[PDB]
């Protein structure tokens with residue numbers, strides 16, 4: 004497969020419907036060796052089942068709000084993977100009240116803080132901690148959403164976190180690039196669904212399978228000439244207007 | 247002038263070199279009535295002197311790091327300007343260690359938090375705090391930089407905060423528009439300089455005059471059709487390549 | 490006014506509904522001295538009447554499809570304005586059959602040629618023809634539309650010509666900048682309308698007044714730091730999504 | 733391979749160094765069945781040798797300036813490929829005088845015409861002619877360059893043609909999307925080379941091999957969720973500033 008011999012860490016697998024599940028699925032098909040992290044114990048047994056299926060034994064706990072937690076997970080990972088080739092950032096979050104209604108009235112200092120810390124910072128937080136472990140030719144991937152670029156109703160402060168994150172992807176790529184590391188993002192279509200379906204050129208919303216293959220590609224040597232790019236896997240929805 | 251009839255609040259004056267000082271002058275020259283803010287004891291005496299030269303005596307303190315400092319300042323403002331036409335938000339901050347060297351090695355969870363808190367959240371926190379006081383036809387303005395769109399060396403976490411900020415401009419613009427408020431941004435060229443003067447289409451870096459003139463317009467009714475935009479006042483530096 | 494001292498050439502007036510008519514008025518209100526152009530016999534009498542109301546009597550013919558029509562018009566201009574401060578290029582054209590239906594089935598090799606020739610090449614062809622006559626501090630302005638950046642139904646080949654046009658603005662801006670000329674563009678909202686009024690942040694389509702006010706500024710020294718930019722005067726319609 | 737069973741037409745193979753050569757190379761490796769076109773007789777024997785190597789027998793003549801020529805080639809192609817799955821547009825052109833020196837002085841009406849017709853129009857010209865032959869799941873690919881988005885010295889009018897072409901890619905995708913056709917572009921880094929090498933994050937220019945794999949991916953079902961996107965395969969050069 005095109006990921007044959009790559010050891011990739013996969014974050015964010017919460018369920019079978021998770022974009023991370025669709026992404027691991029594809030990296031696996033393409034011969035990548037996977038490892039997974041889980042936020043808390045609620046999800047341990049589940050993530051362990053998913054990993055077993057995708058052939059890995061590496062299921063490490065990791066809460067991205069704690070620097071120390073991230074450090075710890077990279078120590079355990081290190082016991083089996085002294086060197087690896089990148090990870091998949093598929094973490095995002097904001098307190099619920101934040102995401103409904105008028106942005107200006109919904110947003111709060113604490114809400115803004117959490118949204119940027121979990122959704123934007125965690126990406127560089129992890130990069131920072133596994134930087135010396137990464138093999139040349141490694142690639143880091145994160146997921147963004149059109150809300151970073153356009154004002155979308157209800158997405159509110161999650162839109163700023165994603166803008167921050169897309170900038171993160173350009174600064175990380177410029178910093179890590181020289182040492183053989185590429186970093187990009189995939190702005191996925193919504194996985195309202197009806198409207199998108201009708202107004203999207205391909206006339207259908209993407210699936211974690213569509214996003215999965217783009218993720219696999221981007222993390223593989225096939226995309227070697229690509230770094231710092233936010234690739235839209237939304238079926239073209241953002242390029243059309245007034246359809 | 248084209249701002250006569252406008253009561254506008256100007257933040258961020260720290261010196262005669264400050265951008266808001268150039269904005270203040272221009273808004274004053276065009277007929278505006280201004281209110282000023284100073285961050286602390288250190289800057290108070292300096293802001294009061296300029297407000298006097300500009301005919302204003304509305305000089306209030308405001309630490310955007312405190313929601314209470316914000317509410318209280320707008321409460322003192324209501325006592326003199328029950329309603330006004332918008333404010334210029336020319337505040338930005340990142341801890342010393344942040345803007346130096348390899349982005350990834352420099353950035354820290356807290357340097358990140360502070361940079362976003364002060365440079366980005368402070369914008370919406372202020373509109374949040376004064377929404378009711380705004381008149382239809384009101385325009386809010388912020389200041390950003392190219393590092394939001396591109397990875398500029400050493401700008402590091404500030405670039406990410408400028409991205410969150412430009413995203414904030416869109417979401418705020420979209421939410422407030424219905425009540426008669428427009429929200430824009432000026433991505434000003436750096437007021438490196440020699441490289442910019444050599445490669446900028448107009449062949450010179452921009453001045454606080456250039457920036458002030460544009461801010462004055464973005465806050466006047468002359469720009470009634472412009473909302474949610476990030477206007478580049480950098481002499482065309484960003485639209486050139488390998489000059 | 491902010492344009493007093495400016496001698497500016499205005500093209501594209503065909504009626505009181507025309508965009509250049511709104512631009513002309515505003516540039517006149519601000520102190521500008523204007524020269525006008527009409528495309529043909531049909532429009533002559535109409536342009537001459539407005540020029541009279543605006544205090545001008547410099548009404549010259551110009552078919553941008555002919556390099557000779559251009560040279561000759563600028564030759565008659567030199568006889569009254571040996572030098573001037575820029576011109577507004579508000580010309581655009583695509584053969585009937587083009588802007589109707591499936592883009593791919595509509596577009597023809599010649600509809601393409603004409604659309605690009607008149608809507609895009611005519612911009613640089615005019616600056617080419619009057620370069621020597623320009624004063625430092627001179628600003629050139631064109632009009633574009635969102636269909637350049639996004640695929641709008643029925644806009645078809647015109648979208649492609651607007652893209653070539655916006656690209657023309659950058660290249661012209663970069664080449665001419667050193668001599669004191671700035672070159673910008675206004676991407677105006679459509680002067681469909683009901684959909685736009687409902688989804689536009691300011692909740693109303695923009696007027697030729699809104700557009701004129703912005704053009705007047707983009708052609709004044711107040712915008713000295715803005716060159717090679719495409720300013721969106723569409724009430725923020727383009728920065729919103731799924732409103 | 734991921735192109736197993738795809739029949740793709742490849743335009744623009746002029747030499748071993750041609751981006752089209754690097755692209756066919758990769759589609760071949762991935763199991764695609766190729767067919768090639770050649771501009772004129774000068775290149776027939778050569779293109780026939782390249783094709784033989786990549787396992788095809790289909791070497792059709794095609795001059796994109798002639799509608800009739802394009803039609804003819806699709807008739808011959810049709811004899812062997814009644815249905816196929818897309819083509820690779822790797823054609824670009826402008827008269828030489830156009831590409832050196834000051835844009836404004838270099839550009840001409842005829843030069844502009846040719847550059848847009850050959851570089852931009854030909855893409856839709858071909859699409860138009862094979863539209864009923866294309867199989868659902870087909871994909872069309874073209875090559876663009878950063879000159880479309882930034883003002884690059886000497887690229888002059890080629891920059892406008894590419895802007896036109898990038899818009900073409902969005903209008904074609906929106907029109908053909910509903911019938912199961914995706915259309916995208918790859919903005920390739922320069923294949924000055926020294927400067928790019930030093931300022932590009934990956935610290936090296938891309939190769940036709942890097943561009944080749946991205947082309948293969950984009951034309952394969954792996955990229956199914958992608959249409960109307962211009963993907964930058966430039967090693968991140970355009971995302972960084974002032975390195």
Ligand SMILES: NC(=O)c1ccc[n+]([C@@H]2O[C@H](COP(=O)([O-])OP(=O)(O)OC[C@H]3O[C@@H](n4cnc5c(N)ncnc54)[C@H](O)[C@@H]3O)[C@@H](O)[C@H]2O)c1
Pocket residue numbers: 014015016017018020021022023041042065066067068093094095096121146147148190191192193194
């Ligand atoms: N659903 C979509 O349409 C869509 C589209 C584009 C982008 N995105 C982004 O893709 C990413 C994946 O989203 P998803 O749709 O799979 O949703 P999800 O809820 O399945 O995954 C988000 C992940 O974030 C994790 N998480 C939250 N806080 C964490 C923390 N403190 N530490 C570690 N993990 C934490 C959760 O465990 C979860 O695994 C998200 O960031 C999302 O915004 C989603």
Ligand SMILES: NC(=O)c1ccc[n+]([C@@H]2O[C@H](COP(=O)([O-])OP(=O)(O)OC[C@H]3O[C@@H](n4cnc5c(N)ncnc54)[C@H](O)[C@@H]3O)[C@@H](O)[C@H]2O)c1
Pocket residue numbers: 257258259260261263264265266284285289308309310311336337338339364365389390391433434435436437
């Ligand atoms: N001058 C430039 O080159 C340039 C270029 C592009 C963008 N900018 C932006 O312009 C804005 C001002 O820059 P400048 O050069 O005029 O700055 P300056 O250093 O003269 O002023 C910065 C202001 O920010 C304020 N500030 C910081 N923390 C604050 C807080 N806690 N509470 C209230 N105020 C706070 C200070 O009081 C200060 O007056 C910033 O957002 C900056 O990022 C400046």
Ligand SMILES: NC(=O)c1ccc[n+]([C@@H]2O[C@H](COP(=O)([O-])OP(=O)(O)OC[C@H]3O[C@@H](n4cnc5c(N)ncnc54)[C@H](O)[C@@H]3O)[C@@H](O)[C@H]2O)c1
Pocket residue numbers: 500501502503504506507508509527528532551552553554579580581582607608632633634676677678679680
């Ligand atoms: N009104 C809108 O909704 C709108 C919105 C966005 C962009 N635009 C752009 O604004 C510009 C004018 O549009 P409008 O609605 O004011 O137009 P209008 O129809 O009132 O005027 C168009 C002008 O183009 C001129 N023209 C065409 N071919 C020409 C040629 N051969 N020589 C000289 N002149 C030529 C005509 O003389 C005419 O005056 C165009 O570029 C258009 O694409 C208009």
Ligand SMILES: NC(=O)c1ccc[n+]([C@@H]2O[C@H](COP(=O)([O-])OP(=O)(O)OC[C@H]3O[C@@H](n4cnc5c(N)ncnc54)[C@H](O)[C@@H]3O)[C@@H](O)[C@H]2O)c1
Pocket residue numbers: 743744745746747749750751752770771794795796797822823824825850875876877919920921922923
């Ligand atoms: N060289 C680069 O760095 C680079 C980077 C990005 C994009 N591009 C674009 O990639 C495409 C491929 O370029 P290349 O570098 O392989 O150069 P090339 O000269 O090898 O290929 C361009 C092709 O255009 C063809 N052509 C010209 N006129 C034609 C016509 N009338 N009909 C049919 N074919 C015609 C030539 O036969 C040639 O095969 C070009 O459009 C180029 O602008 C090049």
Ligand SMILES: CC(=O)N(C)Cc1cc(C(=O)N(C)Cc2cc3ccccc3n2C)ccc1N
Pocket residue numbers: 094095096097102148156157158161193
């Ligand atoms: C609690 C939590 O972990 N959060 C919030 C993270 C999170 C964010 C998204 C998202 O980024 N999306 C584009 C979907 C989405 C969420 C949403 C909320 C309001 C409006 C639109 C919305 N869209 C499209 C998707 C899944 C997800 N788990």
Ligand SMILES: CC(=O)N(C)Cc1cc(C(=O)N(C)Cc2cc3ccccc3n2C)ccc1N
Pocket residue numbers: 338339340341342345391399400401402404436
């Ligand atoms: C400590 C602090 O209060 N900060 C950071 C706020 C602040 C930021 C800027 C800025 O946003 N600019 C583009 C200049 C600038 C800063 C900078 C840092 C590193 C590299 C380039 C840089 N440029 C152009 C300018 C003035 C200023 N007071």
Ligand SMILES: CC(=O)N(C)Cc1cc(C(=O)N(C)Cc2cc3ccccc3n2C)ccc1N
Pocket residue numbers: 581582583584585588634642643644645647679
């Ligand atoms: C024949 C001709 O002289 N043409 C085309 C020039 C021309 C173009 C526009 C335009 O560029 N606009 C965005 C409106 C517009 C035209 C259009 C066509 C189809 C769909 C939407 C459309 N919109 C918004 C407006 C006026 C006008 N005179």
Ligand SMILES: CC(=O)N(C)Cc1cc(C(=O)N(C)Cc2cc3ccccc3n2C)ccc1N
Pocket residue numbers: 823824825826831877885886887890922
């Ligand atoms: C005659 C002909 O067939 N033409 C012009 C098409 C053509 C264009 C390009 C190109 O689009 N490039 C980015 C390279 C390139 C050409 C060029 C010219 C001037 C400046 C930079 C330049 N770059 C980067 C490359 C190859 C090529 N054959």
